[PDB]
Amino acid sequence: SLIETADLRLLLTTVSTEVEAQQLAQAAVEAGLAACVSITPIQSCYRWAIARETEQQMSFKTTVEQLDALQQWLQSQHPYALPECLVLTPIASSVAYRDWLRSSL
Amino acid sequence: SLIETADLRLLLTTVSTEVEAQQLAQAAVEAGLAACVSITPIQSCYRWQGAIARETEQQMSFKTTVEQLDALQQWLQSQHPYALPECLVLTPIASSVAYRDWLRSSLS
Amino acid sequence: DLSSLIETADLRLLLTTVSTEVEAQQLAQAAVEAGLAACVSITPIQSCYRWQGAIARETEQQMSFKTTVEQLDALQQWLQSQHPYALPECLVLTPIASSVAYRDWLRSSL
């Protein structure tokens, strides 16, 4: 059952292509910067004038210990870009999932 | 109108296929454990069984109250196709008065 | 600023759903035009809920409005005048960190 959590983090960022998204996910998990990553296609509307672009939403599961390192490494992979960077803190998790995630880093 | 909230919860998990996701969503709602469930197709990448895997999955977001969360999670665990399901819980910090009321009422 | 994470308390994500892609695109455009959000993202989903006593499953568009707490009230009030549903979903999350560069872009856009 559930345990209240303060040290888990979800890092949400965007990249332009699926190819990049698949590569970033794999190398992030390979490097121990995230335990898992999801990729979701989205359409974004934003001011840059108003642009409408199709991109990939990435959600990286990680801990507060690995977060700063993860965010920097991601930016090193597209240093020209000014990507979305938003982090959420879950208030709870299962014991088992929390332990797997921490063990994977 | 907007109101600060502390008793709403979004439980996030993933399942393999669309059928699995539809069945689990319907049954949670029918059990009165979630007010609504959203399902989004995703690709995931993770370490499992000593390897890095890339797979297509369905992201699920169960909208519920703190009162039903422990029950929903115990139920999920008995019903989930994965041995170790993803289980992450987010807390909204605000809602409309009318939406907050709708969620709570759906589970009353 | 691109490489540095900072704690944020002033950023907000407002989540709602609408029925059609046309609706979503029209709302997202108008929110950015009016300075109420810096960025709006749209994602196709399926949602399951009880309606008129029966379990319904419907295709919808999930929207995520990225904004500040200074604009959040105005956004929500504006949404209620412009949303196609009688009782729209409205859940707001607080990101607790961002990059210096993204937070500044977001603030400067509003």
Side-chain angles (χ1 to χ4, degrees), chain C residues 4-69 71-82:
Chain C
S4 52
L5 218 49
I6 56 160
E7 177 161 340
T8 54
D10 62 309
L11 298 183
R12 294 295 187 281
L13 274 52
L14 188 149
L15 309 188
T16 188
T17 67
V18 300
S19 156
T20 74
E21 194 188 4
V22 165
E23 290 165 344
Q25 287 172 339
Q26 285 175 31
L27 282 176
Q29 166 86 53
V32 180
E33 254 168 4
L36 289 164
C39 176
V40 187
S41 291
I42 302 157
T43 288
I45 64 160
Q46 279 194 42
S47 51
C48 183
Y49 55 97
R50 206 191 287 282
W51 190 68
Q52 296 188 328
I55 302 294
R57 193 164 77 271
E58 304 291 294
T59 46
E60 291 192 302
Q61 304 279 318
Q62 178 63 69
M63 307 186 68
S64 175
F65 296 80
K66 287 85 150 152
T67 190
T68 54
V69 70
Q71 303 306 328
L72 182 68
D73 271 86
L75 175 60
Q76 199 277 326
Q77 295 292 275
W78 174 91
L79 269 166
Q80 282 188 171
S81 80
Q82 306 305 302

Side-chain angles (χ1 to χ4, degrees), chain B residues 75-91:
Chain B
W75 176 89
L76 268 180
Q77 199 50 73
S78 86
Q79 303 304 303
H80 205 287
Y82 296 171
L84 170 50
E86 179 188 274
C87 187
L88 295 173
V89 184
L90 304 186
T91 194

